[PDB]
Design a protein around this ligand. Structure first.
Ligand SMILES: [Mg+2]
Ligand SMILES: [Mg+2]
Ligand SMILES: [Mg+2]
Ligand SMILES: [Mg+2]
Ligand SMILES: [Mg+2]
Ligand SMILES: [Zn+2]
Ligand SMILES: [Zn+2]
Ligand SMILES: [Zn+2]
Ligand SMILES: [Zn+2]
Ligand SMILES: [Zn+2]
Ligand SMILES: [Zn+2]
Lengths: 100, 143, 141, 206, 312, 121, 222, 67
RNA sequence: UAAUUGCGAUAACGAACGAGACCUUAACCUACUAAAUAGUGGUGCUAGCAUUUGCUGGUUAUCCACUUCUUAGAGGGACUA
């Protein structure tokens, strides 16, 4: 059936618990799966001058937002596919499911 | 025991194969040779005037032998160098595309390389066999 | 199957992965023999793992190294570390502990970086200067 | 000796290197003695190396540079005046050529010539600035052996670099006659003249 | 007869935490150490060398706390502070089985005779018993502080009725379990400090348990009654019965006190010489093991060596 | 799957488990989890029962018996020494110490195999 | 069809703009924050405020007009966006709510010390570990100055600042100029229930249970 | 410098005061009992406390310690 | 002591902020969980050079196996032992 679930949050613990209950639901349903592949964490950096005007010591400041991405490959029939996409809703965790 | 291009040092292999191609004399040297510089980042033409095209040909043939498939843009980046921009800092500059494209076409016409799927030029089986034979000769020359 | 081990050596960003298996004595780096490693002023730096213990240790095994990352000299250092660690790991797994300890002792007595990676890492650059420590020129008038 | 055959063939000279470690596979570290009993334990020639390039950490502690091999210390001091900062491959090539030229010009061991140059041109007394009541006075002091080795290397390489600048002679040649003249104490050496001048100034300022 | 120092074995760079020997192979010695490794040694019975390492076993990611050998010596077991047990092929290194399930540091492992099954006492106050293939067939609870050692009691008769194990923890309480049905049967009270070690006699009737207070307490579990206590006057870390004689060796913090039991007196009380360590403290034996014939006593110390003693 | 089929049932040494004909070519008989026929008999030279082990192929070595038995040593200064049933090397652990003929000194090798006293002193 | 970097930055700026809009219009309703939950076919916006009846209005009329406002501005389809109101707990432990209440007291005409001591007493009574309110500006004189009012203990450096201190800043538009209100509240780490229950340097030794010495060897049997 | 602060020193003294016979002169076992017998928020702080505790046990073994 | 960091002394005792702790990052893990968006080995198919068997490559739907190298999650590790 070849579905892939991609999770792309910034919250590591919510991401990991979403991955964990998806994979334990899959092994409970005895579905063959490729495990959660964890992509490299992508760090979004913005470096700015601290001052609103332009005087004083030239102090700089780097802000960063970390994006954590995982994906799970599943071979499961369509009814469990809809039940999976209807369960595991978490705030701040972006989930998408694609087929073939 | 069998040899390959990887068993021979790069410089003397390239010199031997360039001399072989010059002695064979069917590479179709383009004609604007002795006019051009080989790079926008260069300032003088190649000093080995009557050669240097056989040198570039042996170099790109060995490069394609080692790789999977190589194109003209990869070749331009490979042979480009640091340009002296006068009073401003130095910078990497790609080499001339016409020279590399014409030497790729010349190697195709003599049968060393061929058009590859997934683009670029890959070495042909005839190119593999005669580059290997040149490697055998240049490793035997020291005996 | 064939007895074999895999090891690695490191220096800065250069990593060399060595497959040491039972064989007849070929030492290859990036598919080319060990005698063609690029800075020939530094060729003895990858010769010295072979030379300190003798080539009779390498007669019955063959080693293939792939090195990536870093630059020229750091790749040379990673190659020598991967080769020495591969020989020690092979003598650990398939030969006895006396031979392993003698190899380790010889390598350690010559150069600790033959087996233990150099831990020096780049310091991050800080704002207000071109480097980690150096600052822009200060003027007063 | 018997050669051993490998699937990747190894040349006969580097197979010879299995018996003894020699600098650039040519110069034996054995039978090299430091003539000065003060500068032994600070000139390191007991541990052989094949190449004068060891990525070693001698800067963390106060006296590890004494355990650094002396050929690599000369090599390190060659990498100077800004344009040559870094470039240890160029420095080791220059050192290799220098040792070859030394052995050609005199049939001695070039490592022995290098250690004789260092022992001969270490300055044995120096002077230091004092307060002196608003005017600079200089008071003669003694020199520690580590400083003698350091300053000998600096004088030798600075003399070679200055005499190679704007000259048809190469840096390896200039370092070769610099080390040869310092090993003889011939007073045509920059380092010998500088050492003599410093000792004379200190003797005046006792 | 008297014990005399014969030689030392040097392959470790951590505390030699345990020693094991085999009847099947009288020239094999297995030592587990604090450097995350095991070493199998071949003994030679000669001058100062006396033995060489023939294999290192690596793969434990923390301190390996103890080790046992099977009777044939082909299989070895290791318990380590990485909360796992490992079964090794003594010939080729080669971990066959990893036993997981303990939640804290596993401190003791013991195969039973007949290689039927494995007991392991850990720091999560449990004694887990396992199959060879690696499944936890049962777990034993009710032991209120963390377990220091577990041992199996050797049957004098050839498999008379059942198999029993003994255990000591840090709750000043030693226990004896019948694990044919996974119950506790004997519960020996009487210790006043953390019990470090316990040993069952080859006869199967004597239990010696001892710890930090220095009181080596003897028990007759055939009648299930306490008999008496010996005093070492200092902390003792390992105990072992001689397989032929009526001797009990104790690795105290100052020496190794060995006692014969037929007059109940101290016979030798060996102390090695170190040439150093005099300012703070001499290294002391933390493990010891007799040979199968009871002629050589091996002792692993805290200066990362193993010293041997031969009886005359 | 291969067309050829064996007409003969595959039989384990116990014989409890068989593969019914026709048997597809290359089918692998599964050995009985039931004990070895020899274990069921209980026959052994030691006189004990072999360790109860699952059935295996005869070519595969049988697990040996391991009972602490007391056997006389090579020197034999001691009649009974505790050893496992399989082991044939029993050790009194006591040097024979028999005055060598050729030397003033004795032979210290312990548990000397009879007739094996040291040749050089 | 957007990259993940741009999508996550875009919904971050959507959250920031929505929070600014809600704090601009719901200031007199005790608006204490907002939370966004994306869901297949629906995204829900949870407003956390104190006066939920004023946020809702009659039959949720203000809720309907706020949904229509955020819908019209952010181009959502009908039914895809839904707003809920929720009464926040521990109102004393909300720096934004306390700062807004102080702002409205100062606008109504309360004295600065009376308003600041009222807010610090309310926050300390609500179970905070510490409170600190700063009022800056032209106070009774043309020359500006700053007044500080504290109670309890507050920490200033390290990761516990992100863990435990909540801060808020407000601009009060008085007829002589702007006053600045800064409110910092350090909550009790023990009542957290999400994350660390203590400060990093707090060490708790458990009391050993004492047992009587036995002085007699005995065997229990089964 | 390696001077240990009063949180480490006070925790070590309290641990020794109420757990002296349980804990030993070995850092590894002292660490393994300190993490379960006390609630310390950092592995680093637990290691520092267990190390100073082991140091004080050596001091106690060499005669009594004031405080 | 880097540190009002501590040992202590002591008309002060007990505390609070700062320092430290903390958090992020860089170094180690042939130990765990895995990976056709990371790799490696082998088997298919195939090229060249050799000649028993070898060497260097190409081709992922050609499949299998593994996780050393790579990426994370969870942990371990240093506490001046
Ligand atoms: Mg170029
Ligand atoms: Mg430049
Ligand atoms: Mg720089
Ligand atoms: Mg010049
Ligand atoms: Mg292939
Ligand atoms: Zn059967
Ligand atoms: Zn059988
Ligand atoms: Zn038997
Ligand atoms: Zn005997
Ligand atoms: Zn004899
Ligand atoms: Zn004799």
């Amino acid at each position: 059936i070849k579905i892939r679930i991609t999770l792309t949050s910034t919250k590591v613990k919510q991401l990991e618990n979403v991955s964990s209950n998806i994979v334990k639901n899959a092994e409970q349903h005895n579905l063959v799966k490729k495990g959660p592949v964890r992509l490299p964490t992508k760090v979004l950096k913005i470096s700015t001058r601290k001052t609103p005007n332009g005087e004083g010591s030239k102090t700089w400041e780097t802000y960063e937002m970390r994006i954590h991405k995982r994906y799970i490959d599943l071979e499961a029939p369509v009814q469990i596919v809809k039940r999976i996409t209807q369960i595991t809703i978490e705030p701040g965790v972006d989930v998408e499911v694609v087929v073939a | 025991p069998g040899v390959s291009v990887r068993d021979v040092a790069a410089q003397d292999f390239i010199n031997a194969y360039a001399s072989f191609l010059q002695r064979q004399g069917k590479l179709e040297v383009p004609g604007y040779v002795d006019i051009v510089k080989t790079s926008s980042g260069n300032e003088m033409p190649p000093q080995d005037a009557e050669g240097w095209f056989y040198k570039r040909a042996a170099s790109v043939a060995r490069h394609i032998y080692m790789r999977k498939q190589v194109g003209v843009g990869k070749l331009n980046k490979l042979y480009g160098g640091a340009k002296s921009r006068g009073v401003r800092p130095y910078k990497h500059i790609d080499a001339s595309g016409s020279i590399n494209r014409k030497v790729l076409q010349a190697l195709e016409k003599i049968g060393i390389v061929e058009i590859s799927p997934k683009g670029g030029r890959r070495i042909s089986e005839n190119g593999q066999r005669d580059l290997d034979r040149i490697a055998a000769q240049t490793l035997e020359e020291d005996e | 199957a064939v007895p074999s081990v895999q090891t690695f050596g490191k220096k800065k960003s250069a990593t060399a992965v060595a497959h040491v298996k039972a064989g007849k004595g070929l030492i290859k780096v990036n598919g080319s023999p060990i005698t063609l490693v690029e800075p020939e002023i530094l060729r003895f730096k990858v010769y010295e793992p072979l030379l300190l213990v003798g080539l009779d240790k390498f007669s019955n095994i063959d080693i293939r190294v792939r090195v990536t990352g870093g630059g020229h000299v750091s790749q040379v250092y990673a190659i020598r570390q991967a080769i020495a660690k591969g020989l020690v790991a092979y003598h650990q797994k398939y030969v006895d502990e006396q031979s392993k300890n003698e190899l380790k002792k010889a390598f350690t007595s010559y150069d600790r970086t033959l087996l233990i990676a150099d831990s020096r890492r780049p310091e991050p650059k800080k704002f207000g200067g071109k480097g980690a420590r150096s600052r822009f020129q200060k003027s007063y008038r | 000796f018997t050669p051993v055959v490998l699937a990747t063939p190894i040349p006969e000279e580097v197979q010879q290197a299995q018996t003894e470690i020699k600098l650039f596979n040519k110069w034996s570290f054995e039978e090299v003695e430091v003539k000065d009993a003060s500068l032994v334990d600070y000139v390191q020639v007991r541990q052989p190396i094949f190449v004068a390039h060891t990525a070693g950490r001698y800067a963390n502690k106060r006296f590890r540079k004494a355990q650094c091999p002396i050929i690599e210390r000369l090599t390190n001091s060659l990498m100077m005046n800004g344009r040559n900062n870094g470039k240890k491959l160029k420095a080791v090539r220059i050192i290799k050529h220098t040792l070859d030229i030394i052995n050609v010009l005199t049939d001695q061991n070039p490592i022995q010539v290098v250690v004789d140059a260092i022992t001969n041109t270490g300055p044995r007394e120096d002077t230091t600035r004092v307060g002196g009541g608003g005017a600079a006075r200089r008071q003669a002091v003694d020199v520690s052996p580590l400083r003698r080795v350091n300053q000998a290397i600096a004088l030798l390489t600075i003399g070679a670099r200055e005499a190679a600048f704007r000259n048809i002679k190469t840096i390896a040649e200039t370092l070769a006659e610099e080390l040869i003249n310092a090993a003889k104490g011939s007073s045509t050496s920059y380092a010998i003249k500088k050492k003599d001048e410093l000792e004379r100034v200190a003797k005046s300022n006792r | 007869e008297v014990l005399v120092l014969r030689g030392t074995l040097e392959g470790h760079n951590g505390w030699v935490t345990s020693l094991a020997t085999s009847a099947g192979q009288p020239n094999l010695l297995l030592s587990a150490s604090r450097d995350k490794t095991l070493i199998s040694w071949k003994l030679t019975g000669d001058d100062q060398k006396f033995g060489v390492p023939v294999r290192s076993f690596k793969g434990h990611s923390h301190i390996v706390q103890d080790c046992t050998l099977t009777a044939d010596g082909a299989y070895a077991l290791s318990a380590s502070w990485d909360k796992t047990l490992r079964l090794w092929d003594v010939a080729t290194g080669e971990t066959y089985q990893r036993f997981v399930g303990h939640k804290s540091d596993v401190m003791s492992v013991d195969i039973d005779k007949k290689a039927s099954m494995i007991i392991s006492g850990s720091r999560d106050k449990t004694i887990k018993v396992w199959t060879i293939k690696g499944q936890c067939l049962a777990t034993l609870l009710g032991h209120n502080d963390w377990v220091s050692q577990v041992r199996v009691v050797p049957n004098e008769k050839a498999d008379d009725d059942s198999v029993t194990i003994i255990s000591a923890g840090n709750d000043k309480m030693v226990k004896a379990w019948n694990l044919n049905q996974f119950q506790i049967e004997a519960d020996f009270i009487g210790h006043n400090s953390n019990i470090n070690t316990l040993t069952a006699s080859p006869d199967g009737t004597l239990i010696a348990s001892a710890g930090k207070d220095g009181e080596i307490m003897l028990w007759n579990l055939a009648a299930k009654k306490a008999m008496y206590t010996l005093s070492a006057q200092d902390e003792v870390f390992s105990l072992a019965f001689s397989p032929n004689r009526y001797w009990l060796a104790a690795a105290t913090a100052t020496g190794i006190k060995v006692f014969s039991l037929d007059p109940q007196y101290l016979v030798d009380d060996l102390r090695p010489e170190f040439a150093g360590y005099s300012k703070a403290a001499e290294p002391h034996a933390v493990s010891l093991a007799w040979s199968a014939d009871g002629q050589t006593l091996f002792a692993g110390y805290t200066d990362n060596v193993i010293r041997v003693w031969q009886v005359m | 799957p291969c067309l050829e089929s064996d007409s003969n049932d595959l039989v384990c040494p116990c014989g409890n488990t068989v593969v019914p004909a026709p048997v597809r070519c290359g089918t692998k008989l599964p050995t009985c989890n039931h004990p070895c026929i020899k274990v069921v008999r209980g026959e052994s030279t030691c006189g004990h029962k072999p360790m109860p082990h699952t059935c295996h192929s005869l070519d595969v070595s049988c697990p040996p018996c391991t009972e602490t038995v007391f056997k006389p040593c090579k020197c034999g200064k001691k009649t009974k020494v505790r050893t496992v049933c399989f082991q044939t090397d029993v050790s009194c652990g006591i040097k024979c110490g028999i005055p060598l003929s050729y030397c003033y000194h004795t032979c210290q090798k312990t548990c000397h195999l009879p007739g094996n006293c040291q040749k050089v002193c | 069809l957007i990259s993940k970097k741009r999508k996550l930055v875009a919904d971050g700026v959507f959250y920031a703009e929505l929070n600014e809009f809600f704090t601009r219009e719901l200031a007199e309703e005790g608006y204490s924050g907002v939370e966004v939950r994306v869901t297949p076919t629906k995204t829900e916006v949870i407003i956390r405020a104190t006066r939920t009846q004023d946020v809702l209005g009659e039959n949720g009329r203000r809720i309907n007009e706020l949904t229509l406002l955020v819908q019209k501005r952010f181009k959502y389809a009908p039914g895809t966006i839904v707003l809920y109101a929720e009464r926040v707990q521990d109102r004393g432990l909300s720096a934004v709510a306390q700062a807004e209440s102080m702002k409205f007291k100062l606008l109504n005409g309360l004295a600065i010390r009376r308003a600041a001591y009222g807010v610090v007493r309310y926050v300390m009574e609500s179970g905070a570990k510490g409170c600190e309110v700063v009022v800056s500006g032209k106070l009774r004189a043309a020359r500006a100055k700053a007044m500080k009012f504290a109670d309890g203990f507050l920490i200033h450096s390290g990761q516990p600042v992100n863990d435990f201190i909540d801060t808020a800043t407000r601009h009060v538009l008085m007829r002589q100029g702007v006053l600045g209100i800064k409110v910092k509240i350090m909550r009790d780490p023990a009542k957290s229930r999400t994350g660390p229950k203590a400060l990093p340097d707090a060490v708790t030794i458990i009391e050993p249970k004492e047992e009587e010495p036995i002085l007699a060897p005995s065997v229990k049997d089964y | 410098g390696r001077v240990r602060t009063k949180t480490v020193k006070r925790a070590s003294k309290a641990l020794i005061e109420r757990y002296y016979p349980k804990l030993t002169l070995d850092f590894q076992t002292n660490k393994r009992l300190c993490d379960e017998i006390a609630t310390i928020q950092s592995k680093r702080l637990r290691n520092k406390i267990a190390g100073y505790t082991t140091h004080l046990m050596k001091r106690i073994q060499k005669g009594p310690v004031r405080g």
